[PDB]
Design a binder for these strands. Sequence first.
RNA 1: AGAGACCGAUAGCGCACAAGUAGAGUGAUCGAAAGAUGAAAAGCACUUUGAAAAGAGGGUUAAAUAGCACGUGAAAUUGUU
Lengths: 170, 194, 188, 134
Amino acid sequence: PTKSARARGSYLRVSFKNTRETAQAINGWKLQRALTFLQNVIDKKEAVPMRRYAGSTGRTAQGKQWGVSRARWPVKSAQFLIGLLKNAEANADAKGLDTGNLIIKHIQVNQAPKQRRRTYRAHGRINPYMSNPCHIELILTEAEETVQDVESHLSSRQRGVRIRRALTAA
Amino acid sequence: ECMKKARNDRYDLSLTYTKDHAKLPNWLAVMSESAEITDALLTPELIKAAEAAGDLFEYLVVTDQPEDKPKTLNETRPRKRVILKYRVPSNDDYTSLLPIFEYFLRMPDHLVQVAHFRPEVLRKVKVVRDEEIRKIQKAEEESKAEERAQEREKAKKAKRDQELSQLDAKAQKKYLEREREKELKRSMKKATIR
Amino acid sequence: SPQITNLIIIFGMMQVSKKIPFDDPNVLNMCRAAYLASNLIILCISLYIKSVVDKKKDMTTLKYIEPAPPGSSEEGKLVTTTVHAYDVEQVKILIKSQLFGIGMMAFMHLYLKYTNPLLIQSIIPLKGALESNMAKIHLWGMPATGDLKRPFKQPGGLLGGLFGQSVQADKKAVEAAERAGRGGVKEE
Amino acid sequence: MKVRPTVSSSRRKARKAHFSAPSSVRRVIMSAPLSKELREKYNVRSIPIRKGDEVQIVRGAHKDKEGKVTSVYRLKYVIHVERVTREKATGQTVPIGIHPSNVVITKLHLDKDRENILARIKAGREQVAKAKGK
RNA sequence: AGAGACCGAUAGCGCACAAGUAGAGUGAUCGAAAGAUGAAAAGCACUUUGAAAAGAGGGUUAAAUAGCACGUGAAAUUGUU
Ligand SMILES: [Mg+2]
Ligand SMILES: [Mg+2]
Ligand SMILES: [Mg+2]
Ligand SMILES: [Mg+2]
Ligand SMILES: [Mg+2]
Ligand SMILES: [Mg+2]
Ligand SMILES: [Mg+2]
Ligand SMILES: [Mg+2]
Ligand SMILES: [Mg+2]
Ligand SMILES: [Mg+2]
Ligand SMILES: [Mg+2]
Ligand SMILES: [Mg+2]
Ligand SMILES: [Mg+2]
Ligand SMILES: [Mg+2]
Ligand SMILES: [Mg+2]
């Protein structure tokens, strides 16, 4: 509530599927690790595993560290997410949080209203040419995450057994 | 006669409004958070006893908030109290003040009897209490944020001086022009708001 | 206007102050006696106004908002009083205005030893006391309505019209300020 | 209950007429009652409100506020009262629109025209009372 | 001009709106979609991050998950948990 910062963006013209995969890849991570990984994705040094939206995509060796075979490098999604993470960093700094221990606690990509264009087909036909923009929303929280009734309605026979056993034992 | 001093000195009394009542004599007044509470507590016995008390009576309060204005959340905790203040007559005629003193002593019993209200009345009071608590933590946060904002402003000025000092002549010129252009752009963006 | 009337009176009074002999202790003492008589008369009418107020013993409830100190950025304050108490308080502020005037007069006449304002000072405090708001409502008996509405505005001059903001009897605001929880301030 | 064929009790027609009335009709629509003192003085119950009138607000969140009518915005069916104002975000002061039927006229702006009006109303009311009292 | 056991924004005239308009056709002709913030714009000052769009604080309001993609806000379909 007071140990968290949040950021969001709406109607961002970036691929919703790629952004969802990237957000799922960085979900639950430390902020610095997520930023480094996103820059690595932009530089094609680390890959985002394509899990749900992966139909007929390619295979790469960089998916080994995720256990998958299909992974890609959604550069545009990585840039948008880097911008949003930086905004969350600025919000945390303004609030006075320790930005060196922040954790990506919440991240969510939703579909935004679609933008319309046209494409021209054979035999004088017109088909839709749509973009799939997304809303992104994320919450960073400071990480602590250090986590460290009685029988009441017994029968008379049960209670007698308990008492006998206790008397016999001691 | 004592409404001014009661409101000014008593923090808890300042959380309530002040309304007259047709039942009471024109020299008395009721201070409450709810007309339902006023109806439940303004008994004819109390009205008659206060009439008997007369001008010796100063005030009678049922409260859970402190006399002085709290400054911390640990301070602002409920603490049930019943207070009775009155002036001392010069002739020592205490029989007139006996009804007030007796009813005051029996106040906890009557309050246990009748001072239970439907959730709508409770929600009316706890909203005010939550607003007060929020006001306290608000000022706490403004003080902390002001201190850290002063620190950040000093850091910004230091960074500007440190990086602007070692640039080239044309680099400094371009940097100043960019600062001015960005400031003007943001000012025009603020001005273009409908 | 009272300003113009006072200035017109002064135009003749400070003429007479340069023509009546002031080297004469007898004439000076006659003027002093007139000034002290005026002071005692305004004592009398202030006491009579207080007596009329006490006789009336009006217990009507009144609420208003006092402004912050002039020109300050502080919060306002809420006053819930009775009309009896407000009348008493304004009689007392008239008394304090007296005491201030008397002190200033004694300072400029006995320590600095100035003599010109004596004629004007023997009239203007008396005229203001006779023309005051309660010298209207109680001494003269006109009703306390309109400009005679209870929470009188600040008695300032032009700087009063600038910074001496009018007391607010707003029902919307009074209710807002009434339950703000601003009592119990640590005098300190 | 209406009887005359020229009068219509159509809600649609009434609303259309009210919300598309011209300025002269809106003047009569935006009438305000007189105070008790003025009513006793002039034998007139209500009059169309005018800029420069002094009014007291008797309904709404601004009850008991008094002031001079500074503008009669017929287009918005409201009036503007001196010092009955509000603050925008910028802190700029804007007047608050008050319906004239929510105020009472405590002091009238009087010139022969505003008065021929009062004399006509008074004469009509007195005649009607006399005829009914016959 | 007055009415109705009529319809209530896919209904009722094609048209509750800059509708016989926008647009199509060489032309004769064809011909839509599209109403609702709030009592009042009081339509978010100011700080901060950002190249910007915007975000985060903060403010207005009875209410902002009522913020000009504005009453309510279903299902299909989607994201997170
Ligand atoms: Mg497949
Ligand atoms: Mg295949
Ligand atoms: Mg293929
Ligand atoms: Mg073709
Ligand atoms: Mg598609
Ligand atoms: Mg239709
Ligand atoms: Mg529709
Ligand atoms: Mg149609
Ligand atoms: Mg054409
Ligand atoms: Mg709608
Ligand atoms: Mg809010
Ligand atoms: Mg809602
Ligand atoms: Mg709503
Ligand atoms: Mg909605
Ligand atoms: Mg569904």
